Amino acid sequence: ENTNLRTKTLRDGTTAEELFSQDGLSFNDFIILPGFIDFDSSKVNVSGQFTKNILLHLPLVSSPMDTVTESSMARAMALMGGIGVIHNNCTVEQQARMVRSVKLYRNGFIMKPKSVSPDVPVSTIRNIKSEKGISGILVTEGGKYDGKLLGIVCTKDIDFVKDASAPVSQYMTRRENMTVERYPIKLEEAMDVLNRSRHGYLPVLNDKDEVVCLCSRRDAVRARDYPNSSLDRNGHLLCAAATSTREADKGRVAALSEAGIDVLVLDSSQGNTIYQVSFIRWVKKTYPHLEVVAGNVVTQDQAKNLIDAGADSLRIGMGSGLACGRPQATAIYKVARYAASRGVPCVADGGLRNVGDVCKALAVGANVAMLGSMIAGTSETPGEYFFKDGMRAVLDKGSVLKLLAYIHKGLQQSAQDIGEVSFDAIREKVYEGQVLFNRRSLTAQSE
Amino acid sequence: ENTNLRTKTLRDGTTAEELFSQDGLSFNDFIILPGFIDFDSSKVNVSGQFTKNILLHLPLVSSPMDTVTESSMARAMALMGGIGVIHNNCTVEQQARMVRSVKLYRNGFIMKPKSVSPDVPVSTIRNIKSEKGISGILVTEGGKYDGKLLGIVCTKDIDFVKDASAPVSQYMTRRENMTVERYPIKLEEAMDVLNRSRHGYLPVLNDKDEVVCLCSRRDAVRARDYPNSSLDRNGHLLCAAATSTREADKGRVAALSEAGIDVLVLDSSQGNTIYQVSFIRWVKKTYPHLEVVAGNVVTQDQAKNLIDAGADSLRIGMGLACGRPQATAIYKVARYAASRGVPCVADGGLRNVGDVCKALAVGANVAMLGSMIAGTSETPGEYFFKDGMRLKGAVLDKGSVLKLLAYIHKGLQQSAQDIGEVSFDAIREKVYEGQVLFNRRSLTAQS
Amino acid sequence: DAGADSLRIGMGLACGRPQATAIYKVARYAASRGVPCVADGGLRNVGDVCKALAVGANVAMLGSMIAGTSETPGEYFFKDGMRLKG
Amino acid sequence: ENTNLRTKTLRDGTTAEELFSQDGLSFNDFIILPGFIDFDSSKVNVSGQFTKNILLHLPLVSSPMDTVTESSMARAMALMGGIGVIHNNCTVEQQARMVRSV
Amino acid sequence: AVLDKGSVLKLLAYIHKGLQQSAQDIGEVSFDAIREKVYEGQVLFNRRSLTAQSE
Ligand SMILES: Nc1ncnc2c1ncn2[C@@H]1O[C@H](COP(=O)(O)OP(=O)(O)OP(=O)(O)O)[C@@H](O)[C@H]1O
Ligand SMILES: Nc1ncnc2c1ncn2[C@@H]1O[C@H](COP(=O)(O)OP(=O)(O)OP(=O)(O)O)[C@@H](O)[C@H]1O
Numbered sequence A: 001e002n003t004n005l006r007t008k009t010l011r012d013g014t015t016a017e018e019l020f021s022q023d024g025l026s027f028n029d030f031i032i033l034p035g036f037i038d039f040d041s042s043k044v045n046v047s048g049q050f051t052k053n054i055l056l057h058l059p060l061v062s063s064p065m066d067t068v069t070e071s072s073m074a075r076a077m078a079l080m081g082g083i084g085v086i087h088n089n090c091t092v093e094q095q096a097r098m099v100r101s102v103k104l105y106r107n108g109f110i111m112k113p114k115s116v117s118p119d120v121p122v123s124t125i126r127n128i129k130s131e132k133g134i135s136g137i138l139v140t141e142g143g144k145y146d147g148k149l150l151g152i153v154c155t156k157d158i159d160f161v162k163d164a165s166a167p168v169s170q171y172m173t174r175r176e177n178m179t180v181e182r183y184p185i186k187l188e189e190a191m192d193v194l195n196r197s198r199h200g201y202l203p204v205l206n207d208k209d210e211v212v213c214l215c216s217r218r219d220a221v222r223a224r225d226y227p228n229s230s231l232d233r234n235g236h237l238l239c240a241a242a243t244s245t246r247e248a249d250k251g252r253v254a255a256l257s258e259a260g261i262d263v264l265v266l267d268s269s270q271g272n273t274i275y276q277v278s279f280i281r282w283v284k285k286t287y288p289h290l291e292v293v294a295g296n297v298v299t300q301d302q303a304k305n306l307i308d309a310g311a312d313s314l315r316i317g318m319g320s321g322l323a324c325g326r327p328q329a330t331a332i333y334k335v336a337r338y339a340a341s342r343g344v345p346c347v348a349d350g351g352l353r354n355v356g357d358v359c360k361a362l363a364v365g366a367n368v369a370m371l372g373s374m375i376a377g378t379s380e381t382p383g384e385y386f387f388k389d390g391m392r393a394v395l396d397k398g399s400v401l402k403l404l405a406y407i408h409k410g411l412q413q414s415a416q417d418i419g420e421v422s423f424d425a426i427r428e429k430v431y432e433g434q435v436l437f438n439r440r441s442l443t444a445q446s447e
Numbered sequence B: 001e002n003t004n005l006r007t008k009t010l011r012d013g014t015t016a017e018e019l020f021s022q023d024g025l026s027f028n029d030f031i032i033l034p035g036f037i038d039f040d041s042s043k044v045n046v047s048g049q050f051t052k053n054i055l056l057h058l059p060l061v062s063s064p065m066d067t068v069t070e071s072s073m074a075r076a077m078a079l080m081g082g083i084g085v086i087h088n089n090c091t092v093e094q095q096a097r098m099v100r101s102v103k104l105y106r107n108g109f110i111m112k113p114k115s116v117s118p119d120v121p122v123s124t125i126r127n128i129k130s131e132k133g134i135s136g137i138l139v140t141e142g143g144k145y146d147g148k149l150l151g152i153v154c155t156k157d158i159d160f161v162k163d164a165s166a167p168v169s170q171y172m173t174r175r176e177n178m179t180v181e182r183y184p185i186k187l188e189e190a191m192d193v194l195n196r197s198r199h200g201y202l203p204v205l206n207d208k209d210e211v212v213c214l215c216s217r218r219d220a221v222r223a224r225d226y227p228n229s230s231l232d233r234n235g236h237l238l239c240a241a242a243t244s245t246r247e248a249d250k251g252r253v254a255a256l257s258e259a260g261i262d263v264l265v266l267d268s269s270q271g272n273t274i275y276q277v278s279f280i281r282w283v284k285k286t287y288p289h290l291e292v293v294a295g296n297v298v299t300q301d302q303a304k305n306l307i308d309a310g311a312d313s314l315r316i317g318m319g320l321a322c323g324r325p326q327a328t329a330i331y332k333v334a335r336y337a338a339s340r341g342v343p344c345v346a347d348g349g350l351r352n353v354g355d356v357c358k359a360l361a362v363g364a365n366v367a368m369l370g371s372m373i374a375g376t377s378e379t380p381g382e383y384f385f386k387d388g389m390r391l392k393g394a395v396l397d398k399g400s401v402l403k404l405l406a407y408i409h410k411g412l413q414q415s416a417q418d419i420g421e422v423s424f425d426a427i428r429e430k431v432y433e434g435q436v437l438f439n440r441r442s443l444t445a446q447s
Numbered sequence C: 001d002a003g004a005d006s007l008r009i010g011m012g013l014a015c016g017r018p019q020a021t022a023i024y025k026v027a028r029y030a031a032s033r034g035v036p037c038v039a040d041g042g043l044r045n046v047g048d049v050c051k052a053l054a055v056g057a058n059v060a061m062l063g064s065m066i067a068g069t070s071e072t073p074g075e076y077f078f079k080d081g082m083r084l085k086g
Numbered sequence D: 001e002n003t004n005l006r007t008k009t010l011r012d013g014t015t016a017e018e019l020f021s022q023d024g025l026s027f028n029d030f031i032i033l034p035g036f037i038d039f040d041s042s043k044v045n046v047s048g049q050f051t052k053n054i055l056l057h058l059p060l061v062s063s064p065m066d067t068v069t070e071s072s073m074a075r076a077m078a079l080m081g082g083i084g085v086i087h088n089n090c091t092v093e094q095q096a097r098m099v100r101s102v
Numbered sequence E: 001a002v003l004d005k006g007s008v009l010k011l012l013a014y015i016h017k018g019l020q021q022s023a024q025d026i027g028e029v030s031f032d033a034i035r036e037k038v039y040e041g042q043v044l045f046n047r048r049s050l051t052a053q054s055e
């Protein structure tokens, strides 16, 4: 099961360079020829580079459209090993709030735990639960998360109360009878003593009995259930956001960075503009820690200009999902190849209708694929559910989590047939002529 | 009181008796005319009699088909105020097991609580919660539901355990440190102490510290979340099972009675048989506490024999060269049955809300949903992605039946409001009295 | 009886009535009490309008026959070789 | 926003000469690849030469068909920056009258 | 017979804005410029397979 049985010498097939050396191709114009299998598909590494410094376990990105990606969608994507791009069809404050909802969902130490005054009614606690999905409210002097811990409120503390106008001080669990930990605590010790606690929450108090931070058992369980979540150096879910390149958007970017985005995705049908070029340089000079994915491109000429400005990644697509544009398969292969030579990953955006098209798009050179329409009916989308004849406009596809798992197994099985245990491996063998294709006549496509 | 405004003296309309005096009709042949409104649609009682002694808050019954009603579906129906009929395309024991799932899911005093011996591994508890969905396992001498109480195992006692082979006694919470109660106590007081303790479970022990029964906080919340659940005299969800009427099926009926069915439903294409007459008589003689829904009938002649044999209820519907248009059959059979104090179940042909409304209006007390429920997640089957679609097998995915049932409830109320009566019981009576009036539609008057 | 000077006839769920019958019945009753009626809905061509007036309606209400005209609210656009309002 | 950012050196694309060097093409057989933008579309000069000595602000001409171009159509076209061709499915005097009307 | 398209004036304005937006994407501020750059190889095209046209 070694190199001798895997390396093609006969090379009966067509290389990508030959395949894309003529008229522009759709994904249905070609097919990938099988290779040599010595491994179960469960072992296939599907990972791709979203940007220079960000590797995604699942090479899947949710589109920045107001019908697809908001907080809930972005959370789901990061949980499964990919990432979401919060859309920019909202006010600056609204988009920043969505980013915080994603960033602050998972964390190890909760730095600004949600706190209330002892006088607030149970109704506001229940509202916090239904809207923000946060239990374990800390009751503190003044309501400021800054300390003076008086008690905590959990679901079993309010579920039986009939007068929602009652102060939480009546029903909360009071500090006198609470298990807490003092300031110099390491996270691993803190989580261990919490699990021993058999409680959901462990406040960390300073010597004045003030709240420095909070530990949540829900975060422990989330790690166990989603071991491949896309996380940053601080244990938060990764979150991208989209903006245009106009001058007014600079304020929007600043608020987005202050809210914790890890990647900035530029919004333009064609991104090869003096405006996008300036914007990238300004983002790089002002927010170096931020990574920029540059506007939509279809030609190496466009890709050169945006890469020169400092773009950490490129979004590929035009006329894919007007006499100006380019067929997606060709556009991906050409741009992704040029960008690879400059060490820049690429995102396939548009034309990805099924699992097979996503496989081809990665094999031909895209590091990660952007899902717009494949995700349209899932329950993490911003829309609302209604019954015309069946649902709960588009069709209800269920939970995006189950769909992402289905795509993941799809990619793994396609990689197994192609004969490589890695999509990094597939992309390299495609450039080398060891992964071969076959253009299909139109008749061959009908059958 | 607005009797002058609501009672029709002009009577511009067709009475149900005139409408059904000609060729057989389906629900699209006629429309219900508007009445008089002086109430919000929220205040409409849609309840109907499933059988002589069973009133359903929601007049909906899930069909006894292997693709519709098993334990989960029957739970969902009962919780929403309807009921479900476990299908009989299974073995006796499998059907009995499903009945038990429904009956013992919601209940006040848990009588044979799932207990364990101290030597059992953490693995089995995870299995208990996974396969059966129960998280209050009691640790007892000999692992017998009636043995000395030694501890409880709940979710947070197992969150963190890496060697699942470990004994459950290592991580349980010892009886030494549990808040419990002594045998002679009342359910009202037991739930009050349970709510005050902030725990999920409260065991009731005898004077030898042997377990007598168990109180679950989940049943308390299920009561709040589903205040209209179809309950029996002991706080369990109502459940119904189907059977055939041949001699072999007497063993099945004995099994279902022991498993706790509240309604026996006879399954037949045509129920006007010597075999069903004898079966009904036998069920009523040997199992007096069982109500019976008699086989599918389409005519009063058939209804007379099954009612005369002792049926508590009738299933209306048939459709070969033998059958009858569904709207006529419901009206005729229900009208005859009503004069003898027997409710009727509209079975089949109920594709939208309007049909359900019309079926209730024309005499049916309760409607049987087969296809409207076919895609919901509480039906048996597995989900798959065929072509950009989530399907169960096939049919399209309709989401949760709970949300659908609420939709139908709101629909029934709204159409009741137009008709001008605060009750479907009123609508049935006013139809028979000629105060609710219809219009036959010409064919060209379709839309 | 409450004081209406005129009535809108038309409805159409499981509740409503065929439009031609409703206009005739309601208009005939209303006429005996000296009240005119407005045929509302289901008037797609001239013949329907004619029939509705003939059967008792004094006046017809045009919804869809007027939908595209330039005096309606909305802006014009060119979708596919067509001028549309939305 | 100068020549360095606009001139293609990589030349990733197909020239018109290559594109039309084979079987005959309809307009749907090809697509124009994008370039480099440093200006609002409001500034785009769409003008074309109708003839050697006639430059049209709008490069649009109405067909000389009896169902398309008479006086009114020809007037509208010239107003918007283009031109109309009065059709010849009429008597000489009738067509001349239409021209005078324009 | 055909459908009423309204005033040719509004249609000519729509085409005018269409051409201006297509020229912007192509990257030239003039159609005289586009035609010359096409002859020079600085405006490039891409033939589309039949499948690529269906999508
Ligand atoms: N650090 C603590 N010390 C003492 N008691 C605590 C502590 N944290 C939580 N409690 C309380 O212990 C009891 C058990 O926890 P809890 O109600 O959270 O279970 P739960 O159903 O999972 O609710 P939640 O959604 O908040 O986790 C509650 O009354 C809670 O207020
Ligand atoms: N009667 C009791 N006395 C003492 N401890 C108890 C009692 N009942 C449960 N506990 C323990 O309280 C702790 C918290 O209970 P827990 O929240 O895990 O119950 P639960 O019903 O499974 O709620 P949930 O699943 O929503 O978190 C656990 O260690 C549990 O073993």
Ligand SMILES: Nc1nc2c(ncn2[C@@H]2O[C@H](COP(=O)(O)OP(=O)(O)O)[C@@H](O)[C@H]2O)c(=O)[nH]1
Pocket (backbone or CB within 6 Å): A097, A104, A105, A110, A111, A112, A113, A114, A115, A132, A134, A135, A136, A137, A138, A214, A216
């Ligand atoms: N007490 C508590 N706080 C949490 C928990 N999880 C997250 N938080 C924090 O609680 C805050 C809730 O959001 P918030 O600041 O009120 O949103 P805003 O009002 O729109 O600015 C955030 O700072 C979260 O980080 C939890 O489980 N318990």
Ligand SMILES: Nc1nc2c(ncn2[C@@H]2O[C@H](COP(=O)(O)OP(=O)(O)O)[C@@H](O)[C@H]2O)c(=O)[nH]1
Pocket (backbone or CB within 6 Å): B104, B105, B110, B111, B112, B113, B114, B115, B132, B134, B135, B136, B137, B138, B214, B216
């Ligand atoms: N510990 C515990 N037992 C429950 C609960 N709800 C129901 N039960 C009981 O647990 C049992 C269900 O499992 P069981 O019938 O023993 O499975 P079987 O061995 O296949 O018959 C029944 O005795 C129920 O009454 C709960 O919440 N906690």
